[PDB]
């Protein structure tokens, strides 16, 4: 695949400054034209509770829609609640290589 991802993990238990930092990154991946899949992984009292990770992620898609497109909702599966952003810089289709 040329297609590169990257996949940033946060955890519920997460500090703001460490999400803030996380998502500067985020988006500086989508300004390259790639994916960025954040998957978090409860860390085990809130497992009993899928929409502690679905908050956390939503605010990071609220954090960081100015320049991310939205691929699909954050949802608990497999332990990870995961939600994907598509770079804004998307359907060049032309604007490669130079």
Known sequence: KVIDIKEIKLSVKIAQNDINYKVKHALEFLEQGKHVRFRVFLKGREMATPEAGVALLEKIWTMIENEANRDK???FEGRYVNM???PKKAEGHHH???
């Open 96 to 98: 490669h290589h130079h």
């Open 73 to 75: 909702e954050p949802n």
């Open 84 to 86: 994907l952003v598509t």
